[PDB]
Write a protein that binds this ligand. Structure first.
Ligand SMILES: O=c1[nH]c(=O)c2[nH+]cn([C@@H]3O[C@H](COP(=O)(O)O)[C@@H](O)[C@H]3O)c2[nH]1
Ligand SMILES: [Mg+2]
Length: 236
């Protein structure tokens, strides 16, 4: 028996379902950003977005790695600031569940804090989490202090550097912590640093997923150890 003292949640397409429609809007906004920046065709923009997302986990990270001094605020204002936030549905079931859960709850998102806070507000979860590790948390040196774009490379999930930042800032014991995320590479990363893992958004587990649920509220029944009251580890 291994107790769970902490639950760490990704945000986008983890705490709201993919069908919400934010994911396609983000892709479109990134493409529009690249067209605005570089005068690309839309086809070339999309091609570049997917290339940079695949290689660096983020178009912003990718642009900066390629020498372009794009300020995170400019990027997030365009790409997240233009999102259809009204499309995110409140989820009282999820709110009720998180209120019932006695474990520490932490947000671990690649998105910026401004986006994260707006999303949680729409969901009605604005007071459910104890800590938020977001883009800024992982990239302190991209703000204020001027740098060459290669000086402080953007740190984001699935990097193990990102995982460590979450674990240190939130002060968690990976042995007692479950990580929920909709992205398989993020799940693999979390498993590598010793976390228990829940793949959100699919019913079928990947190799590094201890659990998999299509909707995050399903953990109420899919992971019964969340309700276990024993405080210390033990065998049988
Ligand atoms: O370069 C990209 N191409 C994409 O298709 C894409 N879709 C989502 N995003 C970004 O993913 C992050 C989602 O945050 P979570 O850690 O909370 O799921 C946030 O940082 C989003 O901006 C994309 N970035
Ligand atoms: Mg996600």
């Amino acid at each position: 028996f291994s107790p769970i003292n902490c639950l760490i949640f990704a945000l986008d397409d983890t705490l709201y379902p993919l069908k919400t429609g934010i994911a396609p809007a983000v892709k479109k906004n990134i493409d529009d950003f690249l067209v605005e920046k570089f005068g690309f065709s839309e086809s070339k923009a999309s091609s570049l977005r997917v290339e940079l997302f695949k290689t660096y986990g983020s178009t912003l990270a990718g642009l900066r790695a390629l020498g372009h001094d794009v300020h995170p605020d400019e990027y997030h204002s365009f790409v997240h600031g233009r999102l259809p936030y009204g499309s995110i549905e409140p989820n009282n079931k999820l709110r009720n569940l998180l209120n019932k859960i006695k474990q520490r709850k932490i947000i671990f998102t690649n998105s910026d804090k401004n986006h994260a806070v707006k999303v949680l507000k729409k969901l009605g979860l604005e007071d459910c989490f104890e800590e938020m590790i977001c883009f800024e948390t992982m990239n302190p040196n991209l703000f204020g202090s001027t740098t060459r774009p290669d000086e402080y490379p953007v740190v984001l999930k699935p990097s193990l550097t990102a995982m460590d930042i979450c674990i240190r800032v939130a002060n968690v014991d990976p042995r007692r912590t479950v990580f929920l995320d909709d992205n398989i590479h993020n799940i693999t990363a979390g498993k590598s640093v010793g976390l228990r893992t829940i793949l959100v958004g699919r019913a079928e587990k990947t190799k590094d997923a201890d659990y998999a649920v299509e909707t995050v509220t399903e953990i109420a029944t899919a992971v019964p150890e969340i309700w276990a009251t024993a405080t210390a580890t033990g065998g049988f």
